[PDB]
């Protein structure tokens, strides 16, 4: 199933960078003008945890040197 939502989709290709694309994190940190948007804040945390899970993974794969630490 999906990592955070309970949806279970199976849209796939059928054979006969990604960390960069998640910093979405900046594109919503939008929260400056909309300080009351609690929906955005909850979804900001979810996207951030995706980064730290990917950050932790790439370090042990030596893709990223272990000095990496994403901030705002």
């Amino acid at each position: 199933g999906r990592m955070y939502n309970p949806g279970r989709g199976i849209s796939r290709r059928c054979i006969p960078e990604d960390l960069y694309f998640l910093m979405r994190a900046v594109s919503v940190r939008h929260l400056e003008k909309n300080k009351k948007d609690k929906d955005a804040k909850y979804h900001l945390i979810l996207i951030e945890s995706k980064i730290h899970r990917l950050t932790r993974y790439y370090k042990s794969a030596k893709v990223l040197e272990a000095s990496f630490k994403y901030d705002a």
Partner: peptide, 10 residues
């Protein structure tokens, strides 16, 4: 094709 079976409990 995984799609051909793609157009559920536990």
């Amino acid at each position: 094709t995984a799609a051909s079976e793609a157009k559920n409990s536990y």
